[PDB]
Amino acid sequence: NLCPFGEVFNATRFASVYAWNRKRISNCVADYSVLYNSASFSTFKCYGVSPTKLNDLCFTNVYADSFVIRGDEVRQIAPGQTGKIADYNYKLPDDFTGCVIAWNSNNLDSKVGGNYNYLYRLFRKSNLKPFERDISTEIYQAGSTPCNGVEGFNCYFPLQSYGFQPTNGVGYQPYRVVVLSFELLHAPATVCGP
Amino acid sequence: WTIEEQAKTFLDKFNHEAEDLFYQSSLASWNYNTNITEENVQNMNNAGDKWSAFLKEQSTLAQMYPLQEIQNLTVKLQLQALQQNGSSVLSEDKSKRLNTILNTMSTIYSTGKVCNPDNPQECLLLEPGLNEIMANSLDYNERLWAWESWRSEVGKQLRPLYEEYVVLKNEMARANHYEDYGDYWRGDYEVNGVDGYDYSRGQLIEDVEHTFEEIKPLYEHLHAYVRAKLMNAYPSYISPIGCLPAHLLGDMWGRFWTNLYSLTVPFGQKPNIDVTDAMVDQAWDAQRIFKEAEKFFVSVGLPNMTQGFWEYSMLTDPGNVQKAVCHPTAWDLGKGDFRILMCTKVTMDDFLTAHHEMGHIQYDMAYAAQPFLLRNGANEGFHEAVGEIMSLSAATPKHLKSIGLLSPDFQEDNETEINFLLKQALTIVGTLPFTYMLEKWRWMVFKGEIPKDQWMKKWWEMKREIVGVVEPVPHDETYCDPASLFHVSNDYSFIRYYTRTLYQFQFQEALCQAAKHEGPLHKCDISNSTEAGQKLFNMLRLGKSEPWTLALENVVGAKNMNVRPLLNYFEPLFTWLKDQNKNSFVGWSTDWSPYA
Ligand SMILES: *[C@@H]1O[C@H](CO)[C@@H](O)[C@H](O)[C@H]1NC(C)=O
Ligand SMILES: *[C@@H]1O[C@H](CO)[C@@H](O)[C@H](O)[C@H]1NC(C)=O
Ligand SMILES: *[C@@H]1O[C@H](CO)[C@@H](O)[C@H](O)[C@H]1NC(C)=O
Ligand SMILES: *[C@@H]1O[C@H](CO)[C@@H](O)[C@H](O)[C@H]1NC(C)=O
Ligand SMILES: *[C@@H]1O[C@H](CO)[C@@H](O)[C@H](O)[C@H]1NC(C)=O
């Protein structure tokens, strides 16, 4: 009874990173070696473990977070990083055990003229704690003059569009990301390797 | 939340909003310059309007942060670039009129044809057809025809357009609190907040005139030496004491004298230090030229070109399926998209131009991580200098023999040495009077110092006096000869190539000292020196984040432009020329004329 990784890795549409999607995985067999080799991923980095080691392991749940960001930002989907994405959109914990996977999605997510449907959060009054998700639309107040829900001087809407044009350099192209967390609770392991 | 902190955030907003609007304008321009059509003119106009309206809104906000309350230097520099409202201080009519004028001139320039008189439909474009005549023909009358046809049948179209361009551009400049467009252009060199590193727009004119005084003797003697050589190339046509006729100088304007090397080579029996023939025998094509320039850069520790550079650049003529502007340009579109537009031919000229244009790209790549408003050369002269530093090395016989364009037992003489210096002078020293004079004319026109019915009068007066060059045919004020040159009709500043030419030697001195080079500056080739690569890069990666006077001092130890390194590169040739000329006239009378 194999795990529905396809639904996640091969979805036609991906979330914006400000509103990243989490899929719970459970009660299924998961071959993490076939995953590592199922495509060419630009990034496949595991932190508390290794892939061959995971087929020897059982977990209560696996969580698959997915979103799109710029290439030059995939380095932020790692513990201890800082910057716009790790600070304001998606924060891995320092003690993170799990895998970060990413691949180039220029051919799916760019458009002549540019695709602007993917957003990121530009401003926040403080940093997300790990795995929090902020879909707020409040105007960011860069000062003490209050904004009252409108953009203006020292008053900025916090969500901005990536622009993905097929001709951008690699750092500016869209990359699709999947983050796998492995949860072990005082309950039966329901997702295992062979 | 200090003012500085509020401005920091505002600029954070700006950089992210700006990136796409700028990139879309770049793409629109790219289509036009690679494929001239009314539809692409309209799209370019639309994308540039969007960009300018964005800039206008953004600048008026930026000026709400008083610079007086700002200590961060690099913050102050970004808000200084938004201190003027730009091109949108012109009414909609005037702005659409100005764009029409700019597009028409650029279209006329890269699209206009003159037809042969013997063949009323064997038409020729400037590039390649006319340029080839002007680089290779040894016939007074053919060269006179191409030089006169271009200016008569195309330059005349540009005359009334250029007139209104001046009027409109000066209004734009006056609205931005400059005296005229020419003052506006000179602002590229202004530095204000930094003590002991300031530089005013008036000091540029002074430093260019003062520095030019020290170049005259070298030029006087190079002038006198080619003029004696041309006497035998064009029997009957050269006065021994006169200016050189402008159609005999080796290109359409005499901007460079390089193509006169085959007529002025000091030592002709020696191996050819002009590798054009050698690279045709070896089946080199454009790709080989650009892959070789790429090898040169990674040899000093800098990157490959990007894949997008190779897939999207235009490195050869597209053929007649498109109408393109072939003038070599290095494009930084944004978002890590870098391209060169060039109609490369298999010639040492284009070989070296390939290295120089790539040099500018290399600069663009090195400061891509700087904040948007500081993604720029320290000044326009810096940005035009990097490439030329590179070609100084790439042109040396040592380098040319190592990439296999001279025999592996090629031997260097005091004579091959003089051949090389002579050819280098034809290009580098030849262009300086040409470059100074052209901008002086434009500065004067912008300042309102030349009544319109004296434009071509004063132009040729200035040619005869500063440049030693005379028109072969009298020209009416129906002509607009300055506009027959790309940069004038494509609205680019020109003094960059003056200051650039002094910088490039100041820099080469410092790079060669880094690479531990042994003897005189013209035998230096920085290939394979990562210590030289590194010293260069640490200046490239800064962009405009430091005032150019400090950026310069950090590399060469002088906070100002300096002519001595160029003079000393050429000292060996200077003493030779002075000996060569001991029996010839040196200097020129401005009264003689090819026509009477
Ligand atoms: C995604 O689709 C391809 C093609 O059907 C398939 O071979 C691949 O294994 C899929 N990836 C995953 C992780 O299921
Ligand atoms: C040139 O531009 C036109 C639109 O003005 C376009 O339809 C055509 O495909 C372009 N040609 C090339 C080679 O890009
Ligand atoms: C543009 O600049 C001028 C002069 O600084 C200023 O008065 C004006 O308010 C700015 N904005 C607009 C839309 O003109
Ligand atoms: C200038 O500001 C930048 C941040 O914008 C800072 O990193 C840098 O150290 C500052 N230097 C000075 C002289 O203000
Ligand atoms: C060093 O330069 C020489 C030519 O001077 C060239 O033949 C050689 O391949 C270069 N070496 C490296 C490691 O680039």
Author numbering:
A (entry chain B): 334 to 527
B (entry chain A): 19 to 614
Copy out sentences from the published article reporting this entry, exactly as the authors wrote them.
Previous studies have shown that the human angiotensin-converting enzyme 2 (ACE2) is a functional cellular receptor for SARS-CoV-2.2,13 ACE2 is a type I trans-membrane protein with a large N-terminal ecto-domain, which can be further divided into a peptidase domain (PD) possessing the carboxypeptidase activity and a collectrin-like domain (CLD) mediating ACE2 homodimerization. Several structural and functional studies have shown that the specific binding of SARS-CoV-2 to ACE2 is mediated by the receptor-binding domain of the viral S protein (S-RBD) directly engaging the PD domain of the receptor. Since the viral recognition of human ACE2 is a key event in SARS-CoV-2 infection, the soluble ecto-domain protein of ACE2 can in turn function as a decoy by competing against the viral engagement of ACE2 on the cell surface and consequently inhibiting virus entry.
Guided by the results of our initial SPR screening, the ACE2 mutations of S19W, T27W, and N330Y were further combined in pairs or simultaneously in the context of ACE2/active-site-mutant (H374A, H378A, and E402A), which was observed to also slightly benefit SARS-CoV-2 S-RBD binding. The determined affinities were 10.1 ± 1.2 nM, 13.6 ± 1.8 nM, 76.7 ± 10.3 nM, and 19.3 ± 0.9 nM for ACE2[W19/Y330], ACE2[W27/Y330], ACE2[W19/W27], and ACE2[W19/W27/Y330], respectively. For W19, the residue was observed to interact with K458, Y473, Q474, A475, G476 in S-RBD and to provide a total of 52 vdw contacts, outnumbering S19 by about sevenfold, which only engaged A475, G476 with 7 vdw contacts. Sterically, Y330 and W19/W27 were distantly located from each other and devoid of any steric interference. Our structures unexpectedly showed an ACE2 molecule trapped in a closed conformation in complex with the viral ligand. Because ACE2[W19/Y330] and ACE2[W27/Y330] also contained the active-site residue mutations (H374A, H378A, and E402A) and were therefore inert in catalysis, we postulated that a substrate-like peptide was accidentally captured in the cleft during expression, locking the receptor in the closed conformation.
